[PDB]
Amino acid sequence: LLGWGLKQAEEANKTPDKPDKVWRIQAGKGFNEFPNKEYDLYKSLLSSKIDGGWDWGNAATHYWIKGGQWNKLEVDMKDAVGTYKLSGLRNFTGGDLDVNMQKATLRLGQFNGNSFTSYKDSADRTTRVDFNAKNILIDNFLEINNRVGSGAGRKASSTVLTLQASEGITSSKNAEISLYDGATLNLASNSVKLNGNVWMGRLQYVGAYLAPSYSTINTSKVTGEVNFNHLTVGDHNAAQAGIIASNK
Amino acid sequence: LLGWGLKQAEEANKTPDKPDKVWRIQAGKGFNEFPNKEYDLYKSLLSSKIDGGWDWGNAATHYWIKGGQWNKLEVDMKDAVGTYKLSGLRNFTGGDLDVNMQKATLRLGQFNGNSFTSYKDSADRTTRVDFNAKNILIDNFLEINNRVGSGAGRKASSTVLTLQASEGITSSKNAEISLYDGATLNLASNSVKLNGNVWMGRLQYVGAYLAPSYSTINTSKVTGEVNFNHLTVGDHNAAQAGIIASNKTHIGTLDLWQSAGLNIIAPPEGGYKQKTEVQPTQVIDGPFAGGKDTVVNIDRINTKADGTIKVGGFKASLTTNAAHLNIGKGGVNLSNQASGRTLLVENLTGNITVDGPLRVNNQVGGYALAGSSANFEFKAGVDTKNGTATFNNDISLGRFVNLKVDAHTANFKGIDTGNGGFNTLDFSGVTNKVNINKLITASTNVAVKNFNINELIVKTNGVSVGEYTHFSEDIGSQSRINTVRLE
Amino acid sequence: LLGWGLKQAEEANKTPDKPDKVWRIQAGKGFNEFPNKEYDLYKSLLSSKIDGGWDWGNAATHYWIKGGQWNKLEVDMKDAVGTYKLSGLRNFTGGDLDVNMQKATLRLGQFNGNSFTSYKDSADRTTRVDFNAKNILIDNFLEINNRVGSGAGRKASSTVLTLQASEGITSSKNAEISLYDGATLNLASNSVKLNGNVWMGRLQYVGAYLAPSYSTINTSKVTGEVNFNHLTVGDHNAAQAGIIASNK
């Protein structure tokens, strides 16, 4: 009912959140001397301050940071050389990651996909998940603001995912990026070339055929060559996606 | 998870409810002297003690009796002559109507349909809506135990609707009776002839594709001629409907789902019939044997099939208790998606007499790919083990379709598998004889222990090799072929 | 510390319990005319008034009768002819079954075993599970008063299982009857011949090496030929089993 131009304008200027317990993790020695090692990133580094679980209501899995979904985690590598992978961080409710990886290659998929979701509390929080890699190489599917399990329990509010390489964000052939009712996706590399099914707007719940279902892929900072391959807007509803592109 | 035979057995013997405030209304003078007047029934009589409203949560409309949904209303005409109509009593939650109308014609639809629903309180109540007219004449749609609005608020428990004419319950052409997860429908007239889309089992909620969704149409008392016209079981779930019929059940087009059941149960041979707290005895019945003169004359079995892809099929089925499961000239259709759909035309204590072409996707050939193994299946006389499966039509199997018959004596007239190939023509369940009249094979997996095929055509498969006719089990001694003719 | 002769003497004369809601089920028509049919007994008959679940604490499975473990279920066939099987009723806490099956063959195992357990409430109840078949034919393992899951949550009190055929109670080769700290087992057929590992006394909990762990197999009514094959008393504790036999 509002339209996309009001909803994006009210998500474009928000202070992030007010987190108590800003956890901080710094990758020390060991990481910055093996330039081909193919680490894991969850189990080798991030699993210290990210604890999974089971949500009663919409019950599939559950992830947050530490002691509730209102705690910021920030990770500061800045020199860790290698190639890191997520591979299975599904239904991450969480809140305010920050992974600073200069001169490091990321990989958002290996045998399993990823998800980045929020919950609708009374505070209406976003999740502001950041990555700052050098290549990103999506390489499996990634849902942004999905449904956690099935409908009941707690509902899902908006989110923001920011991917900020400095050499390129490619993708696989079967890597379906699929962002839903509240999700955005900021890209800031040069020469984004998503060779997979980008799916803006999707049925968040199983029967909500009258949802507004906005989305955004703000590729404004991409100084190179934006190149989608198969964009797909809308699924059994009146979706109004939008792209804030970069003049090519 | 329970199955239909337990759920119907726990709804068949319940005391109705415990209502405070049993309202009573008696139609007095005025009604019983105008035999053609075409009254209304809600606004002229029933609106005194039925008050509508608006429910917050699942918000469309709302109806109850008086001061909550736990109050019985009973109406006692017994002499009011005319023709009454409901015409628009939608989302009636209510509880325990009783409309006694001898020598009166009812009409459950005029420009609008009806609905009879309950709510899921902590007491788990039914609604036991009754009518006792002389003709009923449904004439527009009627939902039993529907969804009230959309999902939220209060959910819907079971219900019972009883229609008890004494001259006949006909229906329109566009009168879609559609009963859902908890609903039943008792009929007690003579010569029910529902000429509309009876829809047992339906998506009660908008996304609940994993609901059990039982139902029942207990036409046991119908002393005349039960006659459906278009029955449709299941809708995007694993519905298990059931009919407790009255030993003569002509239906027309039957449309199962991928994973839908049906239990047409004929009657038996003699016909029907602190402090501790002793619950009443719950008599519960296993699958018995229908009587001798019990017929189920289905005349078309389609199957709707679309959706996902599972590692198996889905095995639509209908299970009968009748001594004769005739199937008429429309035969058997079977829609086939990527995985292999399956039809199970079972008969526990009877025979099967199919007189129609076994189509696939509504053509007689019916090609199917390797992953899509369209599996026909028949079970004539499972529990008594002396049931024949007579086919009086020249059947025709295309490619990757697998007829199997598990009977006592599987008579035939002609099988054509020389067209497509890869045809598992199983007969391993057959007790002794498979009296096929004519056989055409290309790449067949015949498994018969005793047969009499008095004509055999064996065709080749063009230029490909490794594919051949294969009697892949013990042929025994008493076998016989009166003519072999290779080509 | 009490010894077996006091503990059996205090379980031998107890009034059963005081159950509210004595559910009653009667097998009607259909069952009594197919003498070879090989029914199932849980799913075809008993699943109406026995509902499973999940117990939090010692979490494997959970079974009771209806609305708590203090409700008696009694089933009255008395003419149902066939051959019935249980096949998988594990961790039945329940309380006071009664299955009356004259002229019917039972089978307490087909691809899965059985269990009959209680809980230690403040009322100290038993479970008094009865069967009254014609042959019984155990044919897979059966634990009496086992541990439900692992230790925590609610503990297990005593139980009584009574098997009352009228033609014989045989058993398989791999059918390990194994009754624990509180369990008994009354047999009342003629010619019991248990060809499996009868295991009186067993570690109920994972580390309780100082449990008393009594048991009893009261085969007093067996008018025929009692015949065990491999009896095994005690397991890593001071178990004191006992058999009240029938002079052969």
Side-chain angles (χ1 to χ4, degrees):
Chain A
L1 55 89
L2 294 178
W4 184 75
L6 298 177
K7 182 69 174 176
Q8 190 271 333
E10 85 180 5
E11 302 140 352
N13 46 7
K14 291 175 72 172
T15 61
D17 270 333
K18 183 71 173 178
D20 49 352
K21 292 183 184 293
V22 180
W23 299 106
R24 290 190 289 122
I25 293 172
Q26 175 179 359
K29 69 184 76 173
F31 291 111
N32 53 3
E33 63 185 1
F34 297 107
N36 297 114
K37 192 178 175 296
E38 184 67 28
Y39 297 94
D40 191 353
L41 186 58
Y42 175 71
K43 192 175 263 77
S44 75
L45 192 63
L46 287 172
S47 181
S48 180
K49 298 293 176 66
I50 292 170
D51 48 351
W54 188 273
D55 190 74
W56 294 107
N58 59 24
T61 50
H62 197 191
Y63 282 90
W64 58 91
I65 299 299
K66 177 68 74 176
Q69 294 89 16
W70 52 88
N71 292 312
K72 181 178 180 182
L73 172 64
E74 64 181 1
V75 176
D76 182 77
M77 306 188 198
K78 284 187 173 71
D79 56 358
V81 182
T83 162
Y84 298 90
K85 71 182 182 68
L86 261 292
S87 176
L89 188 60
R90 291 177 61 85
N91 290 319
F92 174 74
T93 62
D96 298 329
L97 287 178
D98 188 1
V99 180
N100 188 359
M101 299 182 288
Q102 273 65 237
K103 63 185 73 66
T105 300
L106 185 57
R107 175 174 292 169
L108 288 173
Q110 188 71 39
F111 180 76
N112 196 359
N114 296 319
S115 296
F116 301 100
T117 313
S118 70
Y119 279 157
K120 185 180 288 293
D121 292 332
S122 66
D124 310 335
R125 63 186 71 253
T126 62
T127 58
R128 303 300 180 100
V129 180
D130 190 2
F131 295 97
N132 196 356
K134 184 252 287 180
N135 296 113
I136 292 175
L137 302 172
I138 304 295
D139 285 329
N140 202 358
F141 64 95
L142 188 147
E143 285 86 4
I144 310 169
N145 198 357
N146 59 358
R147 187 180 65 247
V148 177
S150 298
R154 290 187 294 271
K155 305 296 187 291
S157 67
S158 66
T159 183
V160 168
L161 176 62
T162 300
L163 307 179
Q164 194 177 356
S166 69
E167 292 293 327
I169 307 168
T170 76
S171 180
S172 176
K173 186 62 65 66
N174 54 1
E176 183 180 1
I177 305 171
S178 67
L179 60 153
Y180 299 6
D181 175 79
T184 67
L185 180 67
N186 301 325
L187 305 177
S189 66
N190 52 0
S191 69
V192 176
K193 46 183 72 174
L194 299 171
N195 295 321
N197 189 2
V198 180
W199 191 279
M200 290 191 286
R202 192 171 172 94
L203 290 173
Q204 188 182 7
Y205 298 99
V206 67
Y209 291 163
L210 296 176
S213 70
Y214 303 103
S215 66
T216 297
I217 300 177
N218 185 359
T219 73
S220 177
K221 268 69 183 299
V222 182
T223 63
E225 191 268 330
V226 183
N227 189 0
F228 294 148
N229 192 31
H230 181 78
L231 181 57
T232 303
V233 181
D235 184 73
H236 293 283
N237 54 2
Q240 293 180 357
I243 290 172
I244 305 168
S246 70
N247 77 24
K248 181 63 66 67
Chain B
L1 55 89
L2 294 178
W4 184 75
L6 298 177
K7 182 69 173 176
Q8 190 271 333
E10 85 180 5
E11 302 140 352
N13 46 7
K14 291 175 72 172
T15 61
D17 270 333
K18 183 71 173 178
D20 49 352
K21 292 183 184 293
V22 180
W23 299 106
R24 290 190 289 122
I25 293 172
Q26 175 179 359
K29 69 184 76 173
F31 292 111
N32 53 3
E33 63 185 1
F34 297 107
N36 297 114
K37 192 178 175 296
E38 184 67 29
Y39 297 94
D40 191 353
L41 186 58
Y42 175 71
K43 192 175 263 77
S44 75
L45 191 63
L46 287 172
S47 181
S48 180
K49 298 293 176 66
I50 292 170
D51 48 351
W54 188 273
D55 190 74
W56 294 107
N58 60 24
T61 50
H62 197 191
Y63 282 90
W64 58 91
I65 299 299
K66 177 68 74 176
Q69 294 89 16
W70 52 88
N71 292 312
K72 181 178 180 182
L73 173 64
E74 64 181 1
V75 176
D76 182 77
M77 306 188 198
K78 284 187 173 71
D79 56 358
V81 182
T83 162
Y84 298 90
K85 71 182 182 68
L86 261 292
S87 176
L89 188 60
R90 291 177 61 85
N91 290 319
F92 174 74
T93 62
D96 298 329
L97 287 178
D98 188 1
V99 180
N100 188 359
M101 299 182 288
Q102 273 65 237
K103 63 185 73 65
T105 300
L106 185 57
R107 175 174 292 169
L108 288 173
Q110 188 71 39
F111 180 76
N112 196 359
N114 296 319
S115 296
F116 301 100
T117 313
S118 70
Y119 279 157
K120 185 180 288 293
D121 292 332
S122 66
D124 310 335
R125 63 186 71 253
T126 62
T127 58
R128 303 300 180 100
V129 180
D130 190 2
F131 295 97
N132 196 356
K134 184 252 287 180
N135 296 113
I136 292 175
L137 302 172
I138 304 295
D139 285 329
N140 202 358
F141 64 95
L142 188 147
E143 285 86 4
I144 310 169
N145 198 357
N146 59 358
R147 187 180 65 247
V148 177
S150 298
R154 290 187 294 271
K155 305 296 187 291
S157 67
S158 66
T159 183
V160 168
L161 176 62
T162 300
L163 307 179
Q164 194 177 356
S166 69
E167 292 293 326
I169 307 168
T170 76
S171 180
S172 176
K173 186 62 65 67
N174 55 1
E176 183 180 1
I177 305 171
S178 67
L179 60 153
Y180 299 6
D181 175 79
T184 67
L185 180 67
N186 301 325
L187 305 177
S189 66
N190 52 0
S191 69
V192 176
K193 46 183 72 174
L194 299 171
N195 295 321
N197 189 2
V198 180
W199 191 279
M200 290 191 286
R202 192 171 172 94
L203 290 173
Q204 188 182 7
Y205 298 99
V206 67
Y209 291 163
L210 296 176
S213 70
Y214 302 104
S215 66
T216 298
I217 300 177
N218 185 359
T219 73
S220 177
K221 268 69 183 299
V222 182
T223 63
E225 191 268 330
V226 183
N227 189 0
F228 294 148
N229 192 31
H230 181 78
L231 181 57
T232 303
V233 181
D235 184 73
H236 293 283
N237 54 2
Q240 293 179 357
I243 290 172
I244 305 168
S246 70
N247 77 24
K248 181 63 66 67
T249 312
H250 183 279
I251 75 169
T253 298
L254 173 58
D255 295 339
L256 298 176
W257 189 248
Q258 294 174 353
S259 65
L262 189 69
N263 289 109
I264 296 171
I265 298 172
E269 175 64 29
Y272 284 103
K273 182 173 70 67
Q274 295 180 358
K275 181 66 175 66
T276 73
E277 54 184 0
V278 176
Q279 304 293 322
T281 301
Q282 179 176 356
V283 176
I284 176 170
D285 292 329
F288 54 93
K292 297 296 184 291
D293 48 357
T294 64
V295 185
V296 176
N297 290 315
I298 305 172
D299 290 334
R300 180 64 179 265
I301 302 171
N302 296 323
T303 298
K304 295 185 288 183
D306 55 352
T308 63
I309 293 167
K310 195 176 74 175
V311 298
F314 291 105
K315 192 182 286 292
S317 67
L318 70 94
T319 303
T320 311
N321 199 3
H324 294 281
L325 182 66
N326 301 114
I327 290 173
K329 266 66 187 300
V332 170
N333 193 357
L334 193 152
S335 296
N336 196 0
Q337 204 184 4
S339 294
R341 304 285 82 81
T342 303
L343 191 69
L344 174 60
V345 183
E346 192 173 1
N347 184 352
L348 297 178
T349 65
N351 307 324
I352 291 173
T353 305
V354 177
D355 296 336
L358 281 77
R359 295 182 178 89
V360 175
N361 295 110
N362 199 359
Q363 75 268 17
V364 185
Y367 290 97
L369 57 91
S372 67
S373 65
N375 299 320
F376 295 105
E377 185 169 359
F378 294 92
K379 299 285 185 67
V382 172
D383 292 332
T384 58
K385 295 182 291 295
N386 52 4
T388 71
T390 301
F391 296 5
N392 295 119
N393 195 1
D394 182 76
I395 70 171
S396 295
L397 275 80
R399 189 177 178 180
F400 286 103
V401 289
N402 298 318
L403 174 64
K404 65 180 296 298
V405 173
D406 297 330
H408 178 73
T409 302
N411 299 326
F412 279 91
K413 294 292 184 182
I415 303 168
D416 298 336
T417 61
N419 193 3
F422 291 99
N423 306 119
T424 306
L425 232 96
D426 193 0
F427 296 95
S428 63
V430 180
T431 300
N432 54 9
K433 300 302 291 294
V434 186
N435 300 328
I436 304 169
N437 200 4
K438 185 175 185 293
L439 179 57
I440 294 175
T441 56
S443 71
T444 317
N445 193 358
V446 178
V448 184
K449 293 180 287 294
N450 185 0
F451 56 90
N452 183 0
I453 302 173
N454 56 0
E455 205 282 331
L456 174 56
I457 296 295
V458 174
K459 294 177 71 68
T460 186
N461 50 3
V463 299
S464 65
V465 297
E467 300 175 355
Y468 51 86
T469 302
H470 185 196
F471 290 0
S472 68
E473 68 180 4
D474 183 77
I475 307 300
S477 68
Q478 296 299 110
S479 175
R480 181 177 174 180
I481 294 173
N482 291 115
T483 297
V484 186
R485 183 175 294 112
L486 280 74
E487 61 94 22
Chain C
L1 55 89
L2 294 178
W4 184 75
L6 298 177
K7 182 69 174 176
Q8 190 271 333
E10 85 180 5
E11 302 140 352
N13 46 7
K14 291 175 72 173
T15 61
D17 270 333
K18 183 71 173 178
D20 49 352
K21 292 183 184 293
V22 180
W23 299 106
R24 290 190 289 121
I25 293 172
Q26 175 179 359
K29 69 184 76 173
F31 292 111
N32 53 3
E33 63 185 1
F34 297 107
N36 297 114
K37 192 178 175 296
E38 184 67 28
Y39 297 94
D40 191 353
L41 186 58
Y42 175 71
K43 192 175 263 77
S44 75
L45 192 63
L46 287 172
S47 181
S48 180
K49 298 293 176 66
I50 292 170
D51 48 351
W54 188 273
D55 190 74
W56 294 107
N58 60 24
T61 50
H62 197 191
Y63 282 90
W64 58 91
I65 299 299
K66 177 68 74 176
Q69 294 89 16
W70 52 88
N71 292 312
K72 180 178 180 182
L73 173 64
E74 64 181 1
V75 176
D76 182 77
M77 306 188 198
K78 284 187 173 71
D79 56 358
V81 182
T83 162
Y84 298 90
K85 71 182 182 68
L86 261 292
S87 176
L89 188 60
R90 291 177 60 85
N91 290 319
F92 174 74
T93 62
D96 298 329
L97 287 178
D98 188 1
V99 180
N100 188 359
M101 299 182 288
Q102 273 65 237
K103 63 185 73 65
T105 300
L106 185 57
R107 175 174 292 169
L108 288 173
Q110 188 71 39
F111 180 76
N112 196 359
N114 296 319
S115 296
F116 301 100
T117 313
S118 70
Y119 279 157
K120 185 180 288 293
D121 292 332
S122 66
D124 310 335
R125 63 186 71 253
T126 62
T127 58
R128 303 300 180 100
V129 180
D130 190 2
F131 295 97
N132 196 356
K134 184 252 287 180
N135 296 113
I136 292 175
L137 302 172
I138 304 295
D139 285 329
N140 202 358
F141 64 95
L142 188 147
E143 285 86 4
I144 310 169
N145 198 357
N146 59 358
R147 187 180 65 247
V148 177
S150 298
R154 290 187 294 271
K155 305 296 187 291
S157 67
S158 66
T159 183
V160 168
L161 176 62
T162 300
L163 307 179
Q164 194 177 356
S166 69
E167 292 293 326
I169 307 168
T170 76
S171 180
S172 176
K173 186 62 65 67
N174 54 1
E176 183 180 1
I177 304 171
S178 67
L179 60 153
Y180 299 6
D181 175 79
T184 67
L185 180 67
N186 301 325
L187 305 177
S189 66
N190 52 0
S191 69
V192 176
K193 46 183 72 174
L194 299 171
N195 295 321
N197 189 2
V198 180
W199 191 279
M200 290 191 286
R202 192 171 172 94
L203 290 173
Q204 188 182 7
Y205 298 99
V206 67
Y209 291 163
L210 296 176
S213 70
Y214 302 104
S215 66
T216 298
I217 300 177
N218 185 359
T219 73
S220 177
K221 268 69 183 299
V222 182
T223 63
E225 191 268 330
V226 183
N227 189 0
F228 294 148
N229 192 31
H230 181 78
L231 181 57
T232 303
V233 181
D235 184 73
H236 293 283
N237 54 2
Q240 293 179 357
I243 290 172
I244 305 168
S246 70
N247 77 24
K248 181 63 66 68

